[PDB]
Amino acid sequence: NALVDILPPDSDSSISVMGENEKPDVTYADVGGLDMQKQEIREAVELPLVQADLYEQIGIDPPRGVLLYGP
Amino acid sequence: NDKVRFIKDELRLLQEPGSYVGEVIKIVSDKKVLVKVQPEGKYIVDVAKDI
Amino acid sequence: RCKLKLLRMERIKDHLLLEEEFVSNSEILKPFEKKQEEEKKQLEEIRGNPLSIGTLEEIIDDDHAIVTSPTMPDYYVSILSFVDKELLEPGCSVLLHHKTMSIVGVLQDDADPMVSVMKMDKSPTESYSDIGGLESQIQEIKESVELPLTHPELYEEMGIKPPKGVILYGAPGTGKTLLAKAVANQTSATFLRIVGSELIQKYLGDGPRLCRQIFKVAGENAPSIVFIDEIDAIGTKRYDSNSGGEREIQRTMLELLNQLDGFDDRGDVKVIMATNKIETLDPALIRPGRIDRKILFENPDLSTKKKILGIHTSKMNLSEDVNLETLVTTKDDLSGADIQAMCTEAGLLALRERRMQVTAEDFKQAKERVMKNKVEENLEGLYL
Amino acid sequence: ENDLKDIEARIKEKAGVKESDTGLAPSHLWDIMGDRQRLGEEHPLQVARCTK
Numbered sequence: 001n002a003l004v005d006i007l008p009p010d011s012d013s014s015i016s017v018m019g020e021n022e023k024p025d026v027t028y029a030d031v032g033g034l035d036m037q038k039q040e041i042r043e044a045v046e047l048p049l050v051q052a053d054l055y056e057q058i059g060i061d062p063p064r065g066v067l068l069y070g071p
Numbered sequence: 072n073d074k075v076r077f078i079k080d081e082l083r084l085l086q087e088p089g090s091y092v093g094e095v096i097k098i099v100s101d102k103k104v105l106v107k108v109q110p111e112g113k114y115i116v117d118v119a120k121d122i
Numbered sequence: 123r124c125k126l127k128l129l130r131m132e133r134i135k136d137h138l139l140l141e142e143e144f145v146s147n148s149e150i151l152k153p154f155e156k157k158q159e160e161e162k163k164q165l166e167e168i169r170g171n172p173l174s175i176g177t178l179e180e181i182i183d184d185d186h187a188i189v190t191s192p193t194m195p196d197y198y199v200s201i202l203s204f205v206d207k208e209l210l211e212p213g214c215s216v217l218l219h220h221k222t223m224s225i226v227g228v229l230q231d232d233a234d235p236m237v238s239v240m241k242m243d244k245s246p247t248e249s250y251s252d253i254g255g256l257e258s259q260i261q262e263i264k265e266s267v268e269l270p271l272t273h274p275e276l277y278e279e280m281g282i283k284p285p286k287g288v289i290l291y292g293a294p295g296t297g298k299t300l301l302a303k304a305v306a307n308q309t310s311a312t313f314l315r316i317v318g319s320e321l322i323q324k325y326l327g328d329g330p331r332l333c334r335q336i337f338k339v340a341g342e343n344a345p346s347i348v349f350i351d352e353i354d355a356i357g358t359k360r361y362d363s364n365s366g367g368e369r370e371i372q373r374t375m376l377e378l379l380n381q382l383d384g385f386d387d388r389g390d391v392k393v394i395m396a397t398n399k400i401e402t403l404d405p406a407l408i409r410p411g412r413i414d415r416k417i418l419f420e421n422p423d424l425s426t427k428k429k430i431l432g433i434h435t436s437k438m439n440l441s442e443d444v445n446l447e448t449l450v451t452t453k454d455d456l457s458g459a460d461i462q463a464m465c466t467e468a469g470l471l472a473l474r475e476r477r478m479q480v481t482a483e484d485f486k487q488a489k490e491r492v493m494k495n496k497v498e499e500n501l502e503g504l505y506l
Numbered sequence: 507e508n509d510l511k512d513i514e515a516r517i518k519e520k521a522g523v524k525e526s527d528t529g530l531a532p533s534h535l536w537d538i539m540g541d542r543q544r545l546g547e548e549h550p551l552q553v554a555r556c557t558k
């Protein structure tokens with residue numbers, strides 16, 4: 001009962017990635033309408049992945065979590 | 072020498088039986104303390120000199 | 123003023139008391155006497171080092187018990203039996219020995235998150251006759267609540283059962299809630315206080331279980347006073363309708379009948395109930411023969427508010443411009459919480475100018491703001 | 507007034523808080539039958555229940 005080694009973050013996963021060992025199955029073409037909401041989901045997801053710093057340079061508060069609600 | 076000998080005494084620390092974080096519900100003036108171990112239950116047990 | 127003399131005398135004897143205690147404990151609480159040295163040798167022989175906690179389910183009459191530990195494993199324990207076999211009982215927390223589990227002893231005195239709610243977290247700092255005025259029917263609450271504790275003598279002359287219980291009712295502003303806490307000051311009996319919106323829970327069946335507790339605690343103190351604040355709040359309040367509803371209300375009333383008296387025959391609990399809705403209750407508690415005298419209080423009249431206002435303005439710095447009797451004159455049979463509110467707002471106007479003297483203007487302008495709350499809490503204004 | 511407030515807490519702290527424990531004066535010897543219950547296995551029992 002002592003700390004004898006440390007483990008990397010990568011190892012000791014709940015389950016390994018599905019996005020650089022598999023590829024999502026549904027594309028954006030299989031979505032029809034909700035075009036107003038499509039302008040928003042590329043604001044919510046896509047822009048913080050390619051570069052977070054666009055927001056910083058404006059100085060506008062980032063979006064954090066994504067809530068999807070609906071019936 | 073400093074480097075090689077720190078390892079051997081440190082073995083004692085590594086080969087210790089258990090630790091167990093507790094919290095004092097209350098003292099007793101019988102020079103024991105009521106301690107609730109957090110994963111486990113309650114034990115009334117004697118103290119050391121530091122405290 | 124010149125209450126100095128008191129503070130000195132009390133403080134001085136406390137200083138000596140602290141001294142005596144400290145010195146008494148150290149080196150002249152002799153651990154060198156044979157009655158202390160020989161006692162601990164053979165006490166520790168069976169008393170631990172770690173003393174595994176149990177919870178006592180049941181005893182067996184052979185000097186044994188069956189414990190269930192909070193840790194897990196049950197044990198069929200014996201009893202060292204210098205803690206007096208007939209002195210412990212289910213629900214107690216027990217000291218077991220760490221070689222083989224024997225009841226070394228028994229802890230007494232517990233606390234729960236359910237008696238945390240009851241117990242007092244203050245001691246009143248406003249004592250009696252800060253409810254002064256309306257004092258002509260304070261004689262049926264100082265001769266059935268205070269007195270049998272103060273003199274059992276007078277109730278020996280008549281013999282039979284003493285007075286138990288009072289219910290206070292009237293319009294609000296007759297001081298009921300603090301009156302309960304002020305007769306408690308005098309008697310020096312354990313004063314529990316429980317609000318009646320905590321006897322309504324958003325879960326079902328566990329309501330009666332909370333209420334059943336409250337009087338068992340109280341009888342354990344040989345004298346207690348239990349104040350239920352707003353016992354009209356168990357007959358108007360509900361959460362959701364699938365774990366509250368009529369049923370939750372209904373059960374708790376029935377429970378409180380057994381607690382007030384029923385079969386139990388517990389110790390002395392004086393009960394104080396303040397209510398003003400006295401028709402949402404069982405017709406088995408508001409009968410005389412349980413709650414003996416019922417007390418009515420009426421709005422304070424012209425002469426009574428003269429009594430009330432000298433209570434509140436003694437804390438104020440009065441000017442010679444201040445006329446107390448004209449503040450009384452205008453109102454017609456209205457609440458004594460109003461008088462308390464006008465004095466608070468008078469010190470707020472005095473603070474608005476920044477001056478810790480309270481002037482006549484502040485009372486006389488605050489009066490009208492108070493009266494605007496009666497004459498536009500009903501937007502009809504002058505009756506139509 | 508404030509000296510009074512300070513000294514009550516001091517008296518309380520120095521007296522100490524303790525946990526009451528039951529006794530028995532007609533037991534001045536309890537390790538005439540305490541020693542038998544102690545130190546070997548004669549046994550305190552893991553309680554069970556017959557299911558079949």
Ligand SMILES: Nc1ncnc2c1ncn2[C@@H]1O[C@H](COP(=O)(O)OP(=O)(O)OP(=O)(O)O)[C@@H](O)[C@H]1O
Nearest residue numbers: 252253254294295296297298299300430458459462
């Ligand atoms: N008749 C009165 N005389 C003096 N003070 C009063 C009177 N009525 C109420 N008060 C004061 O009002 C404050 C709160 O009153 P309390 O809560 O004790 O009364 P209540 O009658 O139960 O109802 P409410 O709180 O609705 O007025 C306290 O400062 C109390 O001293």
Ligand SMILES: [Mg+2]
Nearest residue numbers: 294295298299
């Ligand atoms: Mg009220």
